[PDB]
């Protein structure tokens, strides 16, 4: 697997290139926000991002080596986490706000109409501020996003061993990045730990978000694409 043959620099370059674009929201500034209309914009947006995600995933080194059945599992498990880290990343330079899209930049008050949205919003803002305080770099972010993809579903399964050596390669890459940035050796292992522990909170946010989504889907608040339905079903 050429994934394992990749150097840290080749790893970073591959991941930076595979980055999905920042998409725009169907946001219409002529009507006032309702729970249904906000959820509409959010889920429309997520739906379009998903297509880009599926194609980005195939570009994450090693991912292609897995069975279709395993690729399905990993994406099914990680999709919301991945949308969330992206969101938190692009919101870094917007303290107090979440840049869902360049034309959909919200603060915590604009989500009050929506069931559970303010709770998740506050958690997302906290993560964004934390990435901001830590001065997360782009190269580190794409490493984090790929780890989430490969890690989040691997325990809910050889192939499993293949995934771990890819993950190890991404750890080497993260450290390599940190050395290159001139962090001391101790600072490196400390930063690595800080970044990965934030993933536990992204997991947390995803699960709490999933539960609000299912609640709303079961209350017919908003028509969900069939893709979203199936990703949502994946989490029972």
């Amino acid at each position: 697997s050429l994934a394992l043959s990749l150097t840290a620099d080749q790893m970073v370059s591959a991941l930076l290139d595979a980055e999905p674009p920042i998409l725009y929201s169907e946001y219409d500034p002529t009507r006032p926000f309702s729970e249904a209309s906000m959820m509409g914009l959010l889920t429309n947006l997520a739906d379009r991002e998903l297509v880009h995600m599926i194609n980005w995933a195939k570009r994450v080194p090693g991912f292609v080596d897995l069975t279709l059945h395993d690729q399905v599992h990993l994406l099914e498990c990680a999709w919301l986490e991945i949308l969330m880290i992206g969101l938190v990343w692009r919101s870094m330079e917007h303290p107090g706000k979440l840049l869902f899209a360049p034309n959909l930049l919200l603060d915590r008050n604009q989500g009050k109409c929506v069931e559970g949205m303010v709770e998740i919003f506050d958690m997302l803002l906290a993560t964004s501020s934390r990435f901001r305080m830590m001065n997360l770099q782009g190269e580190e972010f794409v490493c984090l996003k790929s780890i989430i993809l490969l890690n989040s579903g691997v325990y809910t399964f050889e192939e499993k061993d293949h995934i771990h050596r890819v993950l190890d390669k991404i750890t080497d890459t993260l450290i390599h990045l940190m050395a290159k940035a001139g962090l001391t050796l101790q600072q490196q292992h400390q930063r690595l730990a800080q970044l990965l522990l934030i993933l536990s909170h992204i997991r947390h946010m995803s699960n709490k978000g999933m539960e609000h989504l299912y609640s709303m889907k079961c209350k017919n608040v908003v028509p969900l694409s069939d893709l979203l339905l199936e990703m949502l079903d994946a989490h029972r």
């Binding site: 297509v51 599926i54 995933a57 195939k58 279709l68 690729q71 399905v72 994406l75 099914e76 069939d226 893709l227 199936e230 990703m231």
Partner: peptide
């Protein structure tokens, strides 16, 4: 099959 499966299969 799943839409995700098709999208990946493509």
């Amino acid at each position: 099959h799943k839409i995700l499966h098709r999208l990946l299969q493509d």
